[PDB]
Amino acid sequence: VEVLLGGGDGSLAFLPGDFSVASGEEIVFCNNAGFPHNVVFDEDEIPSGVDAAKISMSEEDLLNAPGECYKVTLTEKGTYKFYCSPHQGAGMVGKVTVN
C-alpha cells in the first residue's frame, strides 16, 4: 500500500495515518509535501521480536527530494507506531496494524 508523506494543504501528516496491512504486504511511504520526511518506528511500540533498526530509516536519513519514498515490509502481527523525526513534535506520527 502507499502512504503519502505530508498533505498538499501543509499538514505534516501521514496520509493515511492509521491504517492496516496484511503480514508480508509492503508499505511504500512517498513524499508528497512538507519534506524532508523520514519514517522511524518506535522501538517501544512495535511487536515482540521486531528489530526497529531493520524496519526504520536512520534518524539521520531524510527523504529530501520530491520523488523519494521509503518502502518497508512488516511481518510480525500487531500494531506498530512510527513517526517522522523532523516533524515528530508537530504531530507527524502514524500507526499501522499488520494482520
Helical ranges in the chain per DSSP H = 52-55
Determine whether 57 is an active site residue.
Answer: no
Q: Is residue 18 part of the contact set for Cl ion (CB under 5 A)?
A: no
Minimum distance between the CB of residue 76 and Cu ion, rounded to whole angstroms?
A: 25
> Residue with C-alpha cell 507506531?
81
- Identity of the residue, 54 or 60, whose beta carbon is nearer to Cl ion in the bound complex: 54
Alpha-carbon dihedral 26, 42, 35, 90, rounded to 10 degrees: 140
The CA distance from 84 to 4, in Å, is 12
Determine whether 30 is an active site residue.
Answer: no
Minimum distance between the CB of residue 87 and Cl ion, rounded to whole angstroms?
A: 25
Minimum distance between the CB of residue 48 and Cu ion, rounded to whole angstroms?
A: 28
Please give the residue ranges that form the binding site for Cu ion (CB under 5 A).
37, 84, 87, 92
Cell of 45: 511500540
57 is in an annotated binding site: no
- Identity of the residue, 9 or 48, whose beta carbon is nearer to Cu ion in the bound complex: 9
DSSP-derived 3-state class of residue 90: helix
Q: Is residue 50 part of the contact set for Cl ion (CB under 5 A)?
A: yes
